[PDB]
């Protein structure tokens, strides 16, 4: 009986940053309570000022992380103002039945509704919005995010050991298909409804034109960079909704990573990159080793270094001479 | 000795449904005997009426789903009838030398060959036509199936227990590359070989005008979706001769998942989405908790549902209030 | 102390061949001094003459394979001669720190470095150029190999029993973005610096013009195909800096795959295909058992044989009518 359950109130917050939880879980079984509100919004999302009409869970790209475990009850109040202009929904690729609850969540701007779910399998897990007829247009406008669904017991290594992180990041990594002209120009738009027929053209030539870390070029960078200290463990949760990517960490490496995001499984050890299909999320965990910069990529190394996904982590600490040295510096022969 | 075995005759089925077989053999090794009959012809493809000569095993596409288990001899009867204009032969992943059988399986029109080999690794595995300069070309037109080696006692979990099916489909999915004019209309044309420079030019964008599973746009739809109880234990081989695909149930999960198709390795558990390589068929196994439809896509959503690459499933049974539910429905605040 | 370590000197090899190696270690750790020289030299890739500059370690595309045990010390001596124009770096994914090395490795024209690092995870691994704000020109333009990490124990099946290789090959795979005219033509360049603007917007497509085994279309056929015999166990090293690819020994089949290269992890068994994703090596082990041509191929089909991602294999030794035959030779009805 559901009722007899304890009620909790999540506050969200923004990505990358987690909202605060517990890895063993430290009570029964509960209804865990989150509300996003729907924004329409104009972002801009590169250094040259190209504007789009993303569509957003909670106001960003990606929407925030959500976090429970396994056999707690998800309950979604969704909210879509009506300052909004389109109808919305959610699926949850953590939920069973509805479409992921996409069938039940129909919400017209103006409207709310609720929505609950058992979290019956652990792991990370993609949501996004889905409409019908107009699916891939939301979700490549950003209106996607992540939950995690973490075992009672916490995360275990292929030993069946305990991992435990210090810090955890959740990266939404975003595909934008902005129309461009015959000459190769982007188009700007009034309205979301403006682009329908174009926005259709140019998700059908399959080829982003940015691909983007927390909605931006760059987000990831500077006073918004990652940070750990030598000796941390970090987990950094990853979730594409639409396309494929291969994260790599420059510098170091997923100690363990579940590629394709599901606790239940042994996590691979040692990876260099891994694959996280499209419509995944996956986690990776590493110790930081050493200090500096290091840079956080989808190893398409153009879709990184050209369209966009790339960040950094600015690591403090002792450097390890003994892990790497500059045997003799750079000089002239 | 092989003329000491037992044979035994298949007579095949229309792709999604599988022909009669035993999960856990009921007899020993035997020569299982198979006839394909290779028909060029039209196929409409689209719901906007765009027609290709597609290449077909048996005037499908995908080509019929071939079932027998470790350590049986297949014996493929192949017919190339005089009413075709092409060369044509196939590879089997799962054989072992002469290029999977294709450098002995070569048919003009008018004639036939029979090809034996022991299927001596289990799993799923794709089979292809592959003319020697001229494969990508006959694999694109639809020249592609798969083939199911069961273990001689059935599939089994990551701890070594019994897995058993109460139902199989197979999806097959494919990529086509229909030429375009420059303002982007498709070409029709009379015959297959008026395609050739045409068609070699439009693989080689890389990018698919269609996606599309069984065939056609909409295949696995209205009467033809797939179809399941609550509590039915459902297997799914998926198969890409020729590019990536990331499966995903809308609404369900792959709750034991051989993404790369081969039974001697644990299943992957709970996924949401999994990557079957180009050139590969993998397979999925659930049992479904909710009734409803459900949606079976490629999670690129745009090849999904602007390209063509989804079906469904209609599932009966009894709603489960505890797994989901809408605890207020959509209203107006 | 890493002064009373051994030192041993390596003389390296062009691929696809392998240095000597050991794979159970013979000693202790040791100090494994490499030698690199930085080579912009013109190569043509394809058949139609089509010309390109590249950018390479020790004169081939890919770069060399580097091969020491876990827990040795990797110390590379790289030399960018006064005849080359540019500044070249080194990132080893093997490496801890410092992006791999490569913010410790910038070498302008005429000038040396020497770096040394730790191999602390065993398992093959991308190593290429990357210089700020140049890295995917540099790796697209050939300046990528691999390094493999041996368990000090040699490799190990899925139940920890060893498995010894025969014979090991590195097939480098390079996708290259060829700059084209309005009409689709070549442009070819005097220099490296000629290209950069129309570097980036061939780059910006995401559609390679070529995808190539050791530099160049047909490099691993004819004279220059790999060879086996039947029984030999033979262990090939692929690698993709920047792209995902999924090779496929067409007539075998990868009978152990560290699909994503990482030995600690064990292998998946009976492959027909498998995913390398763009930015990481694996390997792959199998044991002849027929005689003849094989092919082995990127399985999308249209990169491996319009773009050029295929090589053969040419197997001697005994025919085996168990395992395969032609009951009745292609004839006419
Ligand atoms: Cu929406
Ligand atoms: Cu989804
Ligand atoms: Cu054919
Ligand atoms: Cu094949
Ligand atoms: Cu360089
Ligand atoms: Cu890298």
């Given at each position: 009986d559901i009722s007899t359950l304890p009620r909790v109130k999540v506050d969200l917050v923004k990505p990358p940053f987690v909202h605060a939880h517990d890895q063993?879980?430290?009570?029964?079984?509960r209804v865990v309570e989150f509300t996003m509100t729907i924004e329409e919004k104009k972002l801009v999302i590169d250094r040259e000022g190209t504007e789009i009409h993303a569509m957003t869970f909670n106001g960003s790209v990606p929407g925030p992380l959500m976090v429970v475990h396994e056999n707690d009850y998800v309950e979604l109040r969704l909210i879509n103002p009506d300052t909004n202009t389109l109808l919305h929904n959610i699926d949850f690729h953590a939920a069973t039945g509805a479409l992921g609850g996409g069938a039940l969540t129909q919400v017209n701007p103006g409207e709310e509704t609720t929505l609950r779910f058992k979290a019956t399998k652990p792991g990370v897990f993609v949501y996004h919005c889905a409409p019908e007829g107009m699916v891939p247009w939301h979700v490549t406008s950003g209106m996607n995010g992540a939950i995690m669904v973490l075992p009672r017991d916490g995360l275990k290594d292929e030993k069946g050991q305990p991992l435990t992180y210090d810090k955890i990041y959740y990266v939404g990594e975003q595909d934008f298909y902005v129309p461009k002209d015959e000459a190769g120009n982007y188009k700007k738009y009034?309205?979301?409804?403006?682009?329908?027929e174009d926005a259709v053209k140019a998700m059908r030539?399959?080829?982003?034109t940015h691909i983007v870390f927390?909605?931006?070029?760059?987000?990831?960078?500077?006073?918004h960079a990652l940070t750990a200290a030598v000796g941390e463990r970090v987990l950094v949760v990853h979730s594409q909704a639409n396309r494929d990517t291969r994260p790599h960490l420059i510098g170091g490496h997923?100690?363990?990573?579940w590629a394709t995001g599901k606790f239940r499984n042994p996590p691979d050890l040692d990876q260099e990159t891994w694959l996280i299909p499209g419509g995944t999320a996956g986690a990776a965990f590493y110790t930081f080793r050493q200090p500096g910069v290091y840079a956080y990529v989808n190893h398409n190394l153009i879709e990184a270094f050209e369209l966009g996904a790339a960040g950094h982590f600015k690591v403090t600490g002792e450097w390890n001479d003994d892990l790497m040295?500059?045997?003799?510096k750079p000089a002239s022969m």
């Open positions: 063993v879980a430290k009570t029964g079984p009034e309205t979301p409804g403006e682009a329908y030539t399959l080829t982003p927390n909605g931006a070029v760059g987000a990831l960078t500077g006073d997923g100690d363990y990573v040295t500059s045997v003799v």
